[PDB]
């Protein structure tokens, strides 16, 4: 299984900054990384980041290395092999060409050459 | 290197498992478990040794009546089939472990008992046919 | 710079030939490709991972081939949901997910 | 098919009871033999688990000084002494029964197990006099 | 020919000891260790019977997660480290005892027994890699 539901899509104007919520059940959230992808209007749909629930580790793109803060906390045991988490999204020197749908997605398999693949995508949210 | 210890990788990937088994395999039958007395814990303590080496026998025998004496990791000529589970490899090895594997194969476990048993059976009587020249 | 297909089409039975290749940046020897079904504004969908390895539950019609310089993806018996905009993506164990430009089907 | 359960064929010649041996190895260590009550009937139950495990492992003991660890069928380089029966193989393998069969070889089976211990002593010394090289 | 019985070759060179090995594998188990009655002679005679048994499979365990099981003299993978024992071939079984040799080599048999039970784990692990074509 395993949902990904996501935030509001509410808008703001340039120079803000604005938080992006994920919210995960039916897997367990430590086990696959969690990436950020962003589809704008004006651009070709752009990798951000993904992000480890478990080891903590993040890599971005160098387009976005220091523009984001992606944050995730500790998983909450529904049983054995089901868990539910949440991650962050945060854009700095934000203007209006930002403007798309945002979508967060868990990695595919937890070893091999396609660990952090995004695999499983939420419902992605509007912006300004 | 890594050496997780006892049932270490028990949340690690079936792959990653499948590699420390003798972790697992030493620890099945020695532990802490000299004379025979008849008290509460006397009592207790044989029964905690001939349990053990019961539950250790009845994996060696079926490890024995499938072709795998002394193996940790041995192959058969029984296909895999589907119905038990169309999960593909990568998806498997480099994603599940042990414990939800088996959780989800437990229908089937005693099905694929039985096909190993008798390819056995039929193996080694190939085996007698073909050094009868 | 992973330059997709303008675009194509085809008919209900037939099939398509998506193509995806760029430098010596991005492609392709050394990195796997990846294929993502991505209806406009909506859930995307994997499609095919590590230059022809399928998704648990995509149609067995789908498939992937890698030559040395460009990767491709072919889409067999065509349905009425073909119709939806497919990107390719060109990556390693430890990296991104360089996307593909777009191709319309 | 056929399916005669266990010691099924224990009337049948001895050929066709021998592709039936899975069935009589699985239930001899198994059958229904959880804390231990030293009672009338417990202290019964702890006789019947140690002897079953006794049993089963002076048979497989006997199975590996022959080199036929985990066999149902394992063939020897000890030729067939006509002294110990002069049948032939069609007047025994599709007529005589395992019973009656052991039997009338019962006399010789102390003699054959000799000569089958020291045949697998010297078989694994000529095999690491070659991997010497 | 000889056989010097059970222990006989005890002060013999390792050499010649290790011709006689089935002579010591047979009388790990039986000896004379029907009903279980709880006496002072019961109670002692359960005992004897169900420390053979653990200390018979402790050996076998071993024996087995290091691909020898079933086998008096089996050859492994392991070199050995002349920090053991600087000893040359000639010398040793031709001349030590075994009682001898293990006084001398005792040190070093907990770190020679984990080189041989990962090179079976690595082992296993390569034929399964090489069966997969
Ligand atoms: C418990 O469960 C968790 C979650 O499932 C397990 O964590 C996962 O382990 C697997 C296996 O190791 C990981 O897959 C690997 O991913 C790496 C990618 O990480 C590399 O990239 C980082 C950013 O680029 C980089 O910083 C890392 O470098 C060091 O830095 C971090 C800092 O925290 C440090 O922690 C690291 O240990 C590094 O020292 C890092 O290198 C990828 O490189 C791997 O691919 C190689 O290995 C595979 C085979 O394993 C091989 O096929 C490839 O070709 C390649 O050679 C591999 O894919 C996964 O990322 C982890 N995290 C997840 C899934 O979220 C954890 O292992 C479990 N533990 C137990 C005990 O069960
Ligand atoms: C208990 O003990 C009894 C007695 O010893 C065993 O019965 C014997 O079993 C053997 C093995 O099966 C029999 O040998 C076979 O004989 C058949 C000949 O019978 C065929 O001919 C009949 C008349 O022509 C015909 O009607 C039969 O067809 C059916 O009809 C009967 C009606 O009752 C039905 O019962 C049958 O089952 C048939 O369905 C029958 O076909 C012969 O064909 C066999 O040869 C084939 O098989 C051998 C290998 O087994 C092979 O080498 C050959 O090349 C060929 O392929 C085989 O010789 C014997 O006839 C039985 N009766 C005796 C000996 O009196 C019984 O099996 C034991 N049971 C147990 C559980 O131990
Ligand atoms: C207990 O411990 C003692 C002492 O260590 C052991 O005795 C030693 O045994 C070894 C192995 O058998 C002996 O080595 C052999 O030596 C002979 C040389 O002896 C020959 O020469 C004598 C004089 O020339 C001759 O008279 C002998 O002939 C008979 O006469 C004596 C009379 O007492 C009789 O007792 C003999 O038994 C003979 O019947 C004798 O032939 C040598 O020939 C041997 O070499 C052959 O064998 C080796 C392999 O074993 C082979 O490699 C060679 O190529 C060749 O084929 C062998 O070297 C040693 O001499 C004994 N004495 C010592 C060391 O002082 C005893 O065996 C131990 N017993 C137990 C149970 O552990
Ligand atoms: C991300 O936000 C948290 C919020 O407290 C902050 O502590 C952290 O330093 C931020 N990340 C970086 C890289 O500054
Ligand atoms: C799978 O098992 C079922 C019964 O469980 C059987 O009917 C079917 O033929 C089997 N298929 C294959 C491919 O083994
Ligand atoms: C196993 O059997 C139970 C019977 O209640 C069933 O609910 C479950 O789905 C089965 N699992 C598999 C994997 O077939
Ligand atoms: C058969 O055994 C006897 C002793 O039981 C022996 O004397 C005889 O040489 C042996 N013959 C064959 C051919 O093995
Ligand atoms: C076995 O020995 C007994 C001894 O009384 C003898 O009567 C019998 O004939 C012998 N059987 C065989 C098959 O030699
Ligand atoms: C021998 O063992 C020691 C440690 O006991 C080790 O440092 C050394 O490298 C080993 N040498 C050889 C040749 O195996
Ligand atoms: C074994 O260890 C003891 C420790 O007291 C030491 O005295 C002895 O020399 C050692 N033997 C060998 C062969 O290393």
């Known amino acids: 299984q395993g949902q990904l539901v996501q935030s509001g899509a509410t808008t703001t104007k340039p120079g803000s900054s604005v938080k992006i919520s994920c919210k995960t059940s039916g897997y367990r959230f430590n086990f696959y990384h969690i990436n950020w992808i962003r589809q704008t209007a004006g651009r070709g749909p752009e990798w951000m980041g993904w992000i480890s629930p478990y080891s903590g580790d993040k890599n971005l793109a160098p387009a976005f290395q220091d523009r984001v803060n992606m944050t995730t906390d500790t998983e909450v045991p529904v049983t054995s092999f089901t868990s539910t988490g949440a991650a962050y999204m945060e854009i700095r020197n934000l203007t209006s060409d930002d403007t798309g749908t945002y979508f967060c997605?868990?990695?595919?398999?937890?070893?091999?050459?396609?660990?952090?693949?995004?695999?499983?995508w939420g419902q992605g949210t509007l912006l300004t | 290197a890594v050496f997780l210890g006892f049932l270490g990788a028990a949340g690690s990937t079936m792959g990653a498992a499948s590699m420390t088994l003798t972790v697992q395999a030493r620890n099945l039958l020695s532990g802490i478990v000299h004379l025979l007395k008849l008290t509460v814990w006397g009592i207790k303590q044989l029964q905690a040794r001939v349990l053990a080496v019961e539950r250790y026998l009845r994996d060696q025998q079926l490890l024995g009546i499938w072709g795998c004496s002394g193996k940790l990791i041995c192959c058969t000529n029984v296909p895999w089939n589907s119905s038990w589970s169309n999960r593909n490899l990568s998806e498997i090895w480099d994603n599940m472990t042990w414990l939800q594997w088996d959780k989800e194969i437990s229908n089937y476990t005693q099905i694929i008992y039985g096909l190993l048993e008798e390819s056995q059976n039929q193996q080694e009587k190939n085996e007698q046919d073909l050094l009868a020249l | 710079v992973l330059t997709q297909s303008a675009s194509v089409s085809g008919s209900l039975g037939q099939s398509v030939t998506i193509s995806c290749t760029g430098p010596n940046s991005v492609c392709c020897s050394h990195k796997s490709i990846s294929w993502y079904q991505w209806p406009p504004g909506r859930a995307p969908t994997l499609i095919i991972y590590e230059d022809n390895e399928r998704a648990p539950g995509i149609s067995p019609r789908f498939s992937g081939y890698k030559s040395y310089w460009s990767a491709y993806l072919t889409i067999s018996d065509l349905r009425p949901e073909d119709e939806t905009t497919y990107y390719c993506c060109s990556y390693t164990h430890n990296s991104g997910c360089v996307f593909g430009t777009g191709t319309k089907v | 098919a056929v399916f005669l359960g266990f010691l099924g064929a224990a009337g049948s010649t001895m050929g066709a009871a021998s592709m039936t041996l899975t069935v009589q190895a699985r239930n001899l260590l198994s059958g229904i033999v959880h804390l231990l009550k030293l009672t009338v009937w417990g202290i019964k139950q702890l006789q019947a688990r140690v002897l079953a495990v006794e049993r089963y492992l002076r048979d497989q003991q006997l199975l590996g000084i022959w080199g036929c660890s985990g066999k149902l069928i394992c063939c020897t380089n000890v030729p067939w002494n006509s002294s110990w029966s002069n049948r032939n193989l069609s007047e025994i393998w599709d007529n005589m029964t395992w019973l009656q069969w052991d039997k009338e070889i019962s006399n010789y089976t102390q003699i054959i197990y000799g000569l089958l211990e020291e045949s697998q002593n010297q078989q694994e010394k000529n095999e690491q006099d070659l991997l010497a090289l | 020919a000889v056989f010097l019985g059970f222990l006989g070759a005890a002060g013999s060179t390792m050499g010649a000891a290790s011709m006689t090995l089935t002579v010591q594998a047979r009388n790990l188990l039986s000896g004379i260790v029907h009903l279980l009655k709880l006496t002072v002679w019961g109670i002692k005679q359960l005992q004897a019977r169900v420390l053979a048994v653990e200390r018979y499979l402790r050996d076998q365990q071993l024996l087995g997660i290091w691909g020898c099981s079933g086998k008096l003299i089996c050859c492994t993978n392991v070199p050995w480290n002349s920090s053991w024992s600087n000893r040359n071939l000639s010398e040793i079984w031709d001349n030590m005892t075994w009682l001898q040799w293990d006084k001398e080599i005792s040190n070093y048999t907990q770190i020679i027994y984990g080189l041989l039970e990962e090179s079976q784990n690595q082992q296993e692990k390569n034929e399964q890699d090489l069966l997969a074509l």
């Open positions: 997605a868990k990695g595919l398999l937890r070893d091999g050459s396609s660990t952090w693949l995004p695999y499983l």
